[PDB]
Amino acid sequence: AVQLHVWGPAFGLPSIDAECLAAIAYLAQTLGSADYQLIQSSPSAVPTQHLPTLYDSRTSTWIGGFTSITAHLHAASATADGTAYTAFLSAHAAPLLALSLYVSSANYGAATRPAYSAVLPLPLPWTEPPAVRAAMARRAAHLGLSSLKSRIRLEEAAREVLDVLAEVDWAAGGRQVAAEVRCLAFGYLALMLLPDVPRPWLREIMEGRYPALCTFVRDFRARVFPQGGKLLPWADGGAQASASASASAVALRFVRAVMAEVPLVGEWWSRWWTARKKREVLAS
Amino acid sequence: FDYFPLRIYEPNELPERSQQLTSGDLPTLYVFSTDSDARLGLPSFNPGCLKWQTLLRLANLDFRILPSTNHSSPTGSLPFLLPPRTSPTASPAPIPASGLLSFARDLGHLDADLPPRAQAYLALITHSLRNAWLCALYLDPTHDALLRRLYVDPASSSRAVRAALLHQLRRAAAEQVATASSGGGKIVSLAPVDSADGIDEEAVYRSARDALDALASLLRESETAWFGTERPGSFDAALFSYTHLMVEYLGRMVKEAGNGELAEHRERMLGVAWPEWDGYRR
Amino acid sequence: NAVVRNIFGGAETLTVNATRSAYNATFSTPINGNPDLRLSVEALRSATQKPWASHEEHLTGANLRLAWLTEKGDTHALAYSSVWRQLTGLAPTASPTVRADAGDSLKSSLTHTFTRDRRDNPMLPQSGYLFRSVSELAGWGPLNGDVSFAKTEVEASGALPVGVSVGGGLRLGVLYPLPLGYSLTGAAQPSRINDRFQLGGPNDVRGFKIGGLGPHDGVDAVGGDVFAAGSVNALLPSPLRLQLYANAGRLVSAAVFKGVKSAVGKLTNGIPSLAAGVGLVYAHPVARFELNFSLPLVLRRGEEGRKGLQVGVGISFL
């Protein structure tokens, strides 16, 4: 009776972020429709504040992150490569993702902002997508590229990642990896391919140069995510009515975020809040 | 115009503090060392600098080492170099961290395009292992004494300033760890999360134990005592930059990675880099 | 700005938020009724930029000051200060003397400012004469910290009419390192770059750049311990009048002693820099604009002297 908290169904992938989509694929391949619940949520609706979060009903513990979630629910060069790529996708690949859909303004404002505003309550989109863009842009450093013949640098910063991810043999070959790192690749290689954006420079690179990835990302979704991934055991209310357990609470989500923005006492108020919230995790 | 300067005399005899430090005869690498072990040339204690110093000592460059303080630098990062001074009032331009191997010159092995596979492991070193060094040094009260003995005491020596520095360090260390998704991608403000509670000392530490298990597994496949090569390259020096500072100062994990691969490898880099030294192992 | 003209007696607070910044939470008060013994308490924080030695400087300290105005025109001001003095701007091509001094310090010190001013117009000398002393004893004995010196500075101008008003001037200074504890013996740490003197530009010795005329390390102007400067005017003629200046200047425990006796011994070996040039003075009630024209004569190699049109304004010229 595990209980995961994920983002919304926005772009045809039952999630809008790589971590939670990866966790959803893992759970859907491993556990079964009668074990989890997928309570769609928001980062300010959980003690961990790191949204892809398992809540184990048996002992009532919050487990943040995808790696830590995989810590539960479970030659050696195989697992060596598994750890290597699982550490190479959380960085040098999340920034390449965040370069689109989170930094490029011509793309952030036509598909991602409606995505967020269509999965939260009414007053929340006024504050949270700003924080999400801020985080994904801060992680989008260490690349030197910004909101931009100034595109050969872009294609090179994309090859420096897709070339490493290319020789994996994600689906069969080269070097079979694992059942928890594969479901992580499809977590990133989906939001880098599938979205319908108005400023595409990530699709054609992979579709035009890397066929081994195009087939996997298309074959994988054809395996566990048929017809948009609604067959997953969502909450009882439905896709949109999933976030029903939390108008009273939504106000508290609003005041907490906006109060952390006053100039001087804001920072200290935030540090008092997350320090109080975290001590609920260890106690759990 | 005209010839107005009627007498031009000799140069003006630079001050005292700029004759003892910057006299110069050898290229002078500026690292995070201490004055007692900066003359003997012992390794630094800041891994982002021990990496470059190890590369240079592998580059067969004979040079000096002088401590510094992270503000005197062409860029933000410290380990720059300053070529020897040619005339007592004029010096060549510094050399930023990136070009230390461009100035050090068969030195092609230390800077090569790594195979597409080992470029994936370098994430373990620079992102998984680097966070365990930040989380365990700065944001652990056990090492409150150690951090104080290295990064602040030789800075200001005035208890109202050491504390102002110490707080600006941990506010910076807790930031660079709270961003890499090993510890936490917690979303809390349109501001970075710089606090020892925006992360978790469990997730960061558990990945580091998994890192040193993957790295130790790569070395057993090499059968040439180094990571798939013949002589120490840019990948051996990057792991030794962390597998040492965590052993000289997490320590039982290195010596227990696999069967002793990372502990033995470190003791075989201090046979190629520091051949006459003794006194490691804490 | 912001003022408060009373709290209890004749007290006052203040705040100025204006180089790149400053925040002076000044809080003045007279003591024992007498309206002269103006005691102050200031807590400033500023990040000023100094381009002649290419870096910044972040003073982030606080100083306590006690002024006093006797009945003969002179004015004593015994001040205690504690600052931070961080140098964090060595981004451009800076010279390896400043790369050895980025660092950080404290500089607990204690000054004393004594200015007997008998000049008629403080902006345009006609018959008066100014004397001014600034004695400073940084961290030593009770004053802790990590800089330990002893700095003094004397300026004694002149003027004489015969309106024509032949002028004059003089400055001096010595920076003496001292040990760190309750003694006159021991280790005397050499001086850093936030304590050495500067001398040049249109305010001090007309005819050189704002920081030149000193020991140079390439393009940056690191200071010097001991120094001296002169001047001679004419001030020939409404406040708008003309000028003929011919300036000058230099800039350079048994160990620390024979070091100073050697420098000031060198201070009289050879012609000084000794610039020259004419100008037009404008005696505004708050300032003195110059708009001059200079031709430097003698130079110590590498000292960057201007060669004309040196417009500059201030209060304390030479």
Numbering used by the authors:
A (entry chain C): 2 to 75, 105 to 178, 237 to 260, 263 to 336, 339 to 376
B (entry chain A): 24 to 128, 141 to 262, 264 to 285, 301 to 333
C (entry chain B): 156 to 173, 179 to 322, 332 to 406, 414 to 428, 447 to 512
List sentences quoted exactly from the publication behind this structure.
The SAM complex facilitates outer membrane β-barrel precursor protein folding and insertion into the outer membrane. The SAM complex consists of one copy each of Sam50, which spans the mitochondrial outer membrane, and Sam35 and Sam37, which sit on the cytosolic side of the membrane. Sam50 forms a 16-stranded β-barrel which is minimally closed between strands β1 and β16. The structures of Sam35 and Sam37 reveal that they each adopt a GST-like fold, which is also completely different from the BAM lipoproteins.
In addition to using lipid nanodiscs, we determined the SAM complex structure in the detergent GDN using cryoEM. In this sample, 3D reconstructions exhibited several conformations, with monomer and multiple dimer conformations present (here, the term monomer refers to the SAM complex, with one copy each of Sam50, Sam35, and Sam37; the dimer refers to two SAM complexes). The monomer conformation, although determined to a resolution of only 3.7 Å, is virtually identical to the monomer determined in lipid nanodiscs and to the monomer derived from dimer 1, described below.
